[PDB]
Design a protein around this nucleic acid. Structure first.
Ligand code: MG
Ligand code: MG
Ligand code: MG
Ligand code: MG
Ligand code: MG
Ligand code: MG
Ligand code: MG
Ligand code: MG
Ligand code: MG
Ligand code: MG
Ligand code: MG
Ligand code: MG
Ligand code: MG
Ligand code: MG
Ligand code: MG
Ligand code: MG
Ligand code: MG
Ligand code: MG
Ligand code: MG
Ligand code: MG
Ligand code: MG
Ligand code: MG
Ligand code: MG
Ligand code: MG
Ligand code: MG
Ligand code: MG
Ligand code: MG
Ligand code: MG
Ligand code: MG
Ligand code: MG
Ligand code: MG
Ligand code: MG
Ligand code: MG
Ligand code: MG
Ligand code: MG
Ligand code: MG
Ligand code: MG
Ligand code: MG
Ligand code: MG
Ligand code: MG
Ligand code: MG
Ligand code: MG
Ligand code: MG
Ligand code: MG
Ligand code: MG
Ligand code: MG
Ligand code: MG
Ligand code: MG
Ligand code: MG
Ligand code: MG
Ligand code: MG
Ligand code: MG
Ligand code: MG
Ligand code: MG
Ligand code: MG
Ligand code: MG
Ligand code: MG
Ligand code: MG
Ligand code: MG
Ligand code: MG
Ligand code: MG
Ligand code: MG
Ligand code: MG
Ligand code: MG
Ligand code: MG
Ligand code: MG
Ligand code: MG
Ligand code: MG
Ligand code: MG
Ligand code: MG
Ligand code: MG
Ligand code: MG
Ligand code: MG
Ligand code: MG
Ligand code: MG
Ligand code: MG
Ligand code: MG
Ligand code: MG
Ligand code: MG
Ligand code: MG
Ligand code: MG
Ligand code: MG
Ligand code: MG
Ligand code: MG
Ligand code: MG
Ligand code: MG
Ligand code: MG
Ligand code: MG
Ligand code: MG
Ligand code: MG
Lengths: 122, 129
RNA sequence: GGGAGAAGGCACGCUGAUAUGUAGGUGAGGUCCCUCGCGGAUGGAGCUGAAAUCAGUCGAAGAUACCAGCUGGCUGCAACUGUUUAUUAAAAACACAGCACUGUGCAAACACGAAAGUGGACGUAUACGGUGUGACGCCUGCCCGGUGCCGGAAGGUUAAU
RNA sequence: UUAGCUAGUAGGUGGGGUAACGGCUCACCUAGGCGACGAUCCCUAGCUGGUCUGAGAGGAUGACCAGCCACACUGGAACUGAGACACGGUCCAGACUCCUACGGGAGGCAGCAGUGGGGAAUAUUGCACAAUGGGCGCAAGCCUGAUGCAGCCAUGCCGCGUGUAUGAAGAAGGCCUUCGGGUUGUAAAGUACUUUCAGCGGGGAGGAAGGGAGUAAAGUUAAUACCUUUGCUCAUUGACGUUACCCGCAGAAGAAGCACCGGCUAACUCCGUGCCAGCAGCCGCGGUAAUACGGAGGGUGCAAGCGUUAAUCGGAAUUACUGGGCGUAAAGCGCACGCAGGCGGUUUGUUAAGUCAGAUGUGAAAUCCCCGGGCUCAACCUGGGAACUGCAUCUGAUACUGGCAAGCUUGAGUCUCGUAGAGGGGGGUAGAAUUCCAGGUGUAGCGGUGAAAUGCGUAGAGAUCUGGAGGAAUACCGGUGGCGAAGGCGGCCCCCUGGACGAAGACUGACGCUCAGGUGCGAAAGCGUGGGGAGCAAACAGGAUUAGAUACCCUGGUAGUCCACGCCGUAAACGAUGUCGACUUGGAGGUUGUGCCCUUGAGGCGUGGCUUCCGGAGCUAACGCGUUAAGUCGACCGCCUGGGGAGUACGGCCGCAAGGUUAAAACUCAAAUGAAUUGACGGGGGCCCGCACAAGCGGUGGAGCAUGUGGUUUAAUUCGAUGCAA
RNA sequence: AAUACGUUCCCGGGCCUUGUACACACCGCCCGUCACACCAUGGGAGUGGGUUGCAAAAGAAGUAGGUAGCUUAACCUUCGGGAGGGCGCUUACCACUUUGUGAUUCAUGACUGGGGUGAAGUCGUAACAAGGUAACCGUAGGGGAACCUGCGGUUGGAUCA
């Protein structure tokens, strides 16, 4: 790494890829759910996480985790995915924006309500 | 081979001081005479002495204080692979004023403090810290 | 090396100019030498003569007639050029260079001939006969029980005498 | 993982053309030009002043604002004109949309609004030329979807408000509790005080300078007309506008949410769950006391915003120029030669290219920054200043570097003379041994392992003596000894030959070092052609052991090993340590010279070269390396950026072939790794014991019974213990 | 009563040392075919789009060059016409369009080479201690698979009384 070696062959920069490639640098892209199905995660956890397999707006086909405690999602219904890797489901990188545009919020949740789309209680 | 006589001189000073020599010796030259003159002026050697008619040996008598070395660190700046020519505002100030930096200016070889008081840059040969 | 003339496309007549026939070829004179003759140099007259460019013009069509590749893609079989069922079969059959095995020490093995002899060969294991396979690349795996062939002559059976 | 490209192509001469030079365009000629300092080709992209980040060097990026370029449905072409090859012009062709009397016609929002569509996502089919600027006009004036303003949007930045004070019955109520109580909490109620902003009414600047009439003075002028300049009285010209701002009214009224609380990260307890529901930015939570999930109470942080996502930079010294690393963590080409390139000892003289210094031109303004001014403050607007780290020009200086010219001798090399050497290439030859053959003896076993067997043997083997034949390797010397650049090289002799090192001299006089591409050598295995073929021996067969054993072990045994020619170009090609060169305490040996001293006996005092072990400061993550450095440095080259995927695919070059070389991605995990430490473990070692084994006596397991258990059976056969240690 | 010669092995311990890829700590962790599912990746008879090179055909309007024809107000003119112009024809250049043929890139494609992840699946036990045959590197052959064997190399291998 002398300066003659540097001008003969330059110091190559450190480029790297985005971990959410299907969003196309859009913060929320709108997907149509083709499937909604449960999967048990990879060990040492054990549950039945709900992954909705959506076809995005730009032709991409990705599954995406569903948050909250329970849901209402079927197929044929447009939702918004927002990125963010769920650690324990192998090969799922997106969450669904709970509250957005067909997927209503959790039932009777009182705290953290903006993250799950629930109006103020009176 | 001997691709840097000035770094030969500086490495000999650093080695002799870190190995507790008293009178180190090297082959002489005009730039070595000028740099050793700067060091004897500022007080990083006791006295230098160039002996020899056709090809001489320059001898440097090293200083000590309480056993420890006097030159704490000494290094090149403008090595021959990559030379460092510096303008007057972009001059160094090694060790926040304490150490000296030898600059060859148009008016011979002189310490960077004298270079700032004469108002011209040059080439930085060493950072006697 | 090939493929390949791959495919595919353009120009093509006549007339005028360059040039009253060009470049090139041939070389008469004439002049000088000349070891003097069917000798050699500049010398280019005359003769012949492409081919190209520009312009003009004609026809519907300029290689105008006769002569004169159909081309491309995938694949089988065979390496190819060759040869054959004269006279229903020309091939995927036969051969082939190459590979291997085997026989043969020269009065060769082998064949044709009772035999002489001759081919082998006026050659001598890098040669010759026979057999199978059929360029080149990657390769040729297991079995000696059967039938052959080669080595044994210790033993059983064994002919003429 | 694009090495060739270029036919008007590079240049010339002549003609033409252009506002202007020019292959701009032609005729003819020359055969050139571009290219590893990246031509050509592919993909992406408007560029810049700047903006975001960064301490800084940089990285990303080009929204508003400003400059420049390009385009105006797509593809062309020219005209008019000063200026276009023309946004709201012409002509041609095309797709789309629309009208038709079917002959034909028309149109181009990437102008401002707006619509449909796409999208996660981005506004009114608003008022005025009052201001600034533009176009025309002598002007008045007209046009002006530029511009000034209004509407929308928490999109950002900034400012303000939701009261203030008193107030302990520490009220109730919630929540928790060791049932004392704590907490919500001076918080609420209460009593007193204020009215910012929103609402109600009143006053109201400034953005307005101009323009239009008339008059006075002057200038032209034959002219006191006309016109222009200078003043002088008049009504005057605002979309914003219900303006900025000021003043008065009445009342605490009309005005607080979001995220988080296991660590990182400020903030903890109860209840509901029970590997379910779920959270997650990473480490991990959840299996019956969850500070991590859901709810409550409490708190912490931000606040008219709070978060989640996306995107950049930082942290990331995690692409390192400032600012990394290479023995073992990923990383030194297998080794050498060497062109370009990079660097270059020492003395003098010149030049002054690089360097430095002053001045000049310049770096548009805006922004950034420093002082300042204004909008009540801030955001914002704005004056002056440096900066604009640059570029060019002039003028200097001469230390370094460069050029140029002359010198030196230490670096590099040449000669003279030896020494040491398994250095290489070619040809001879020697003995020991193995095998095969042939012959003699002589008899029943040989060979083999852990134990056997297949095999060889009554056709006379193995042992044994003689004569051959053949091929290969060279016992002892032999030693971390030597030589070579690396691979490597091992009996002896000859022929050819390279290199090293030492001594006194002499000589050339920077001729040096490193080296991308390029080339040459490069173990073994492998391939081709042709020989040889004793041993050994993959493949293969048979025998065993085994659960099976396509292995180890045994009996055989073909490639191959070997010789000559080539090809492959790989190895844990290792010192896992690129080359060169300098300097830095020592000891122990070995090897090969050499100087001296009396080699006074197989000594002793030094200097070289080469080489192995211990070790100091230094260094190192530690281990360890340690004058042969992994110490302190310099020159040049190679290489690495998490583990896999993978030194693999594809593509190129090479290869007859096996394959070599160059060499990614998608995905996937939060690790993979190096050194050392404590344990544990070993069919590792050493030492030692124990009824462990040995040496002995007796017993169970066989039979019958007692008793406990596992199973079955049942209405219940209660429950618990279940390796030793039930 | 019997027997103890002794430590060669048998298991369980104790201490030092060494090696380690093991720490619920060898009853440890670990490697590869096979069977099923899923994802991405290459080859794949091909097939369909995008862009683009080449060689060519092509010729609307426009310009520039020429000209038989028709025609014309500005100049000369003897009034005859002359110059010059316009239209028209034509040649040059060039767009749309057309054919042929490559180059690149994307999508898709039965089937397949390998790769990765998965619930107590099947067959083994190759590696880590001398891992029970020391491992490993290269290369070749073989084989259900870890791998085994040949030839050469390395210590990054263990025991040294
Ligand atoms: Mg067929
Ligand atoms: Mg044939
Ligand atoms: Mg034929
Ligand atoms: Mg015939
Ligand atoms: Mg016939
Ligand atoms: Mg015939
Ligand atoms: Mg026939
Ligand atoms: Mg005969
Ligand atoms: Mg045949
Ligand atoms: Mg055949
Ligand atoms: Mg066969
Ligand atoms: Mg037989
Ligand atoms: Mg037989
Ligand atoms: Mg056989
Ligand atoms: Mg026989
Ligand atoms: Mg010209
Ligand atoms: Mg001209
Ligand atoms: Mg930084
Ligand atoms: Mg334009
Ligand atoms: Mg246009
Ligand atoms: Mg014009
Ligand atoms: Mg005009
Ligand atoms: Mg216009
Ligand atoms: Mg328009
Ligand atoms: Mg618009
Ligand atoms: Mg819409
Ligand atoms: Mg929509
Ligand atoms: Mg609207
Ligand atoms: Mg106006
Ligand atoms: Mg108008
Ligand atoms: Mg606002
Ligand atoms: Mg209470
Ligand atoms: Mg008010
Ligand atoms: Mg006003
Ligand atoms: Mg005013
Ligand atoms: Mg929260
Ligand atoms: Mg805390
Ligand atoms: Mg939460
Ligand atoms: Mg539990
Ligand atoms: Mg609980
Ligand atoms: Mg949390
Ligand atoms: Mg950085
Ligand atoms: Mg980051
Ligand atoms: Mg590092
Ligand atoms: Mg390693
Ligand atoms: Mg390594
Ligand atoms: Mg090396
Ligand atoms: Mg070299
Ligand atoms: Mg120099
Ligand atoms: Mg200069
Ligand atoms: Mg500026
Ligand atoms: Mg102020
Ligand atoms: Mg100089
Ligand atoms: Mg001398
Ligand atoms: Mg000399
Ligand atoms: Mg090279
Ligand atoms: Mg070999
Ligand atoms: Mg061979
Ligand atoms: Mg073979
Ligand atoms: Mg052979
Ligand atoms: Mg043999
Ligand atoms: Mg290698
Ligand atoms: Mg080696
Ligand atoms: Mg080694
Ligand atoms: Mg290496
Ligand atoms: Mg260091
Ligand atoms: Mg050491
Ligand atoms: Mg070093
Ligand atoms: Mg190190
Ligand atoms: Mg490869
Ligand atoms: Mg370790
Ligand atoms: Mg016993
Ligand atoms: Mg019993
Ligand atoms: Mg019983
Ligand atoms: Mg019981
Ligand atoms: Mg119980
Ligand atoms: Mg129990
Ligand atoms: Mg003890
Ligand atoms: Mg132990
Ligand atoms: Mg240990
Ligand atoms: Mg571990
Ligand atoms: Mg085990
Ligand atoms: Mg594919
Ligand atoms: Mg035309
Ligand atoms: Mg094992
Ligand atoms: Mg075993
Ligand atoms: Mg083993
Ligand atoms: Mg093994
Ligand atoms: Mg091992
Ligand atoms: Mg085998």
């Amino acid at each position: 790494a002398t300066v003659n070696q540097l001008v003969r062959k330059p110091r190559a920069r450190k480029v790297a890829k985005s971990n959410v490639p299907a969003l196309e640098a859009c913060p929320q892209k709108r997907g149509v759910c083709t499937r909604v199905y449960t999967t048990t995660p990879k060990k040492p956890n054990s549950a039945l996480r709900k992954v909705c397999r959506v076809r995005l707006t730009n032709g991409f086909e990705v599954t995406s985790y569903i948050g909250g405690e329970g849901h209402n999602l079927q197929e044929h219904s447009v939702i918004l995915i927002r990125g963010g890797r769920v650690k324990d489901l192998p090969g799922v990188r997106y969450h669904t924006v709970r509250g957005a545009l067909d997927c209503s919020g959790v039932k009777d949740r009182k705290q953290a309500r903006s993250k799950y789309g629930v109006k103020r209680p009176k | 081979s001997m691709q840097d006589p000035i770094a030969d001189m500086l490495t000999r000073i650093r080695n002799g001081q870190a190995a507790n020599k008293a009178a180190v010796t090297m082959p002489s030259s005009k730039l070595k005479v000028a740099i050793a003159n700067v060091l004897k002026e500022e007080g990083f050697i006791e006295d230098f002495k160039v002996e020899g008619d056709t090809k001489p040996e320059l001898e440097l008598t090293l200083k000590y204080f309480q056993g420890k070395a006097v030159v704490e660190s000494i290094q090149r700046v403008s090595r021959p692979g990559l030379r460092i020519y510096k303008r007057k505002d972009e001059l160094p100030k090694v060790m926040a004023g304490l150490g000296i930096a030898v600059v060859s200016t148009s008016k011979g070889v002189m310490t960077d403090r004298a270079a700032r008081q004469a108002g011209l840059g040059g080439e930085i040969i060493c950072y006697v810290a």
